[PDB]
Symmetry: C3
Subunit: 171 residues, 3 copies
Amino acid sequence: KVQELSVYEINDLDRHSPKILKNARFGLGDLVPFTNKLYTGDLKKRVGITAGLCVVIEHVPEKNGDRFEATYSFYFGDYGHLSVQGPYLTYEDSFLAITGGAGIFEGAYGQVKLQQLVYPTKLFYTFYLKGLANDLPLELIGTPVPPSKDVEPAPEAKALKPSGVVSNFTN
Amino acid sequence: KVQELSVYEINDLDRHSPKILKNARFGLGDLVPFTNKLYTGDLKKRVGITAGLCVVIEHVPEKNGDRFEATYSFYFGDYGHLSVQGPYLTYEDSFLAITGGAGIFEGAYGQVKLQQLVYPTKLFYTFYLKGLANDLPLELIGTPVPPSKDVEPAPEAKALKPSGVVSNFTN
Amino acid sequence: KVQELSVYEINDLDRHSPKILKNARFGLGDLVPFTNKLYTGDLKKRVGITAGLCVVIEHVPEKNGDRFEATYSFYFGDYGHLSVQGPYLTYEDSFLAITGGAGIFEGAYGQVKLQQLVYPTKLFYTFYLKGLANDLPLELIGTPVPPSKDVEPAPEAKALKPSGVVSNFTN
Ligand SMILES: [Mg+2]
């Protein structure tokens, strides 16, 4: 069965990220190691971080954007993590492959929808998760805030209050 | 059930690829972001591109070749993509792991045979695909042209004619 | 069913590894392509190598350590390989996702426990392997030597004697 799981990835520019390694405008040769903050779909709790690498594939002169090939993980503190591989395109939504998971996400497979909001500041993901041993914990599956350019994490989540973080949230 | 899927990866050297990032002869430290053209097994249609990264592991003085560790995706336009992780060896055939997929390839698992033809210009892959929700579309499963150093994509595919490309082929 | 598989990864510093690519103390931007030796859990045989990339995510001033995001494979000679994606933390144990496999490991999924021993010299992994077509070969599933800072591969394995290597062990 498909378990849907949405999360917000938010870049506050306090994590040295994205650290552009310029070897190539974005072109092949450009490497972008990155790590952003990760929040629940309902924006109430900090869950952890994203962490991995974007490989610039090319600039697209046409759509004033770039195409990346991405390999990264989404960390949910004590819950574990999900891993993905796929396209990140600055100019449209994309689906990435779910390569696997750990913790509650052990056995994870399927695909994930990546949704553009602010560039490169806010992203909204919806994981179409199969293969989990159990139903997702309730604190991770609150009704997601519908994505827009203005939606924001709860103050307690930004501030890192016990009420706005999951157990041993990834920092 | 195993669905077999063969594709030709072709480098025309018009995509800035391979963009060698020399930090190490090929040795550890060398990083090779790459992207090539991707065609159907029967060579009739352009499907998309490959895109990802080869990490040089070592030079092999013995077999006048090199060993790479590769993380990349195969893009099939509107159909989605397949992702892989594994060995690329300039001197023999290898099998890579299928890490996942998106679109029609959602749930993909198994292994893929990589076959050397021209170096590093033409490769022939055979995906032993399990986990797909449906049978592969007929335009992707035409009887493959048996691999050799001379086999070539149809003129319409090189030229990008409607008859020689899949829907929204990855470019 | 879960098949448990333990292996020792050992760095002898004869493989040019880890080849630190300094772009950032370890911080984001730092890239660490690596390849180490790989032995059976019972330390009797050389099976192959590890090979892939660690992406520094950040230094942790608190725990005098660093957090990495890792994408790599474990090579077992003629048997094939396993691929993973996940966290490598110099200061605690971690679980990585099993993204797939090839050979006898085709269809592999699950998670792997990474255990710290010497830094960065000896690691002990325990793969909780699901999805394999057959039971693991007996030479790979000998009772593992319980991990400590002093445990070592058998002399024949270091020396590469026929009795201390698997068939076509990855070198
Ligand atoms: Mg997988």
